Amino acid sequence: QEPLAAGAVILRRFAFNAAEQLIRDINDVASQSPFRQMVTPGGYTMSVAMTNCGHLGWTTHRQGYLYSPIDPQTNKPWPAMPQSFHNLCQRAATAAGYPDFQPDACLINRYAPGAKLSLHQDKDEPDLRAPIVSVSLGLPAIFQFGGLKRNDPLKRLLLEHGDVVVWGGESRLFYHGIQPLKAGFHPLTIDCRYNLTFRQAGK
Ligand SMILES: O=C(O)CCC(=O)C(=O)O
Ligand SMILES: [Co+2]
């Protein structure tokens, strides 16, 4: 299935089949670059653990964000993006109408019950030409999606295991975020939610 909105679609239950292989390749990456909490420059500490794969990796600190080839926690390169991450990503991107997308970054998020991503706009990328591909894995989450300005009426959507969201073009600098993840069980993730966001950061 494929719905909305405006240079952005939801590919519903798109990563369903590959979820077992994604989870496995998430784990493989994690055994190299582990998950960790990150302190926002505003002093707040994020309830979302995260790590990276691909050419570039995004981390926030006290001075601010950074895209890096080096993992600041290991002082070695971020794991190469797994075959299945790459394949899945462009297969989503094509179906979303971005045939010439190729990411170099992949920020992997892990949410516990009560974890939240504050409303933000994917901003720290120089090349606004490329779209964002978000993969939802595990427990269901409510993903809010507004627009350019902060005050745009947000719309609340249930993102479920396998669900995929691609946004770019006119909808690229759009405010979006995550509400406190409700507790539950999922076969594959047990009691959490994984989320991959694919991005072009270099080029
Ligand atoms: O968990 C999500 O679906 C949101 C991910 C996101 O927007 C980000 O990593 O910047
Ligand atoms: Co984002």
Residue numbers in the entry: 12 to 214
What sentences appear in the manuscript?
The AlkB enzyme recognizes and repairs other alkylated DNA lesions such as 3-methylthymine (3-meT), 1-methylguanine (1-meG), and 1,N6-ethenoadenine (εA), albeit with lower efficiency.
We determined the structure of the full length E. coli AlkB protein in complex with a 17-mer ssDNA oligonucleotide containing a 1-meG lesion to 2.2 Å resolution and the structure of the AlkB holoenzyme in the absence of nucleotide substrate to 2.9 Å resolution. The protein was crystallized under aerobic conditions in complex with 2-OG and cobalt(II) as the metal ion. The use of cobalt supports DNA binding but prevents catalytic activity. Greater insight into DNA binding and substrate base recognition comes from a comparison of the AlkB-ssDNA complex with the AlkB holoenzyme structure. The hydroxyl side chain of T51 is positioned to make hydrogen bonding interactions with the backbone amide nitrogen of residue Y55 to stabilize the conformation of the T51-Y55 loop. Superposition of our structures of the AlkB-ssDNA complex with the unliganded AlkB proteins (core r.m.s.d = 0.772 Å) reveals little difference structurally in the global conformation of the proteins. Instead, our data indicate that AlkB is a fairly rigid molecule, and the flexibility and dynamics of the nucleotide recognition lid is more localized to residues Y76 and the T51-Y55 loop and not the whole domain, although we cannot rule out movement of this domain during intermediate DNA binding steps.
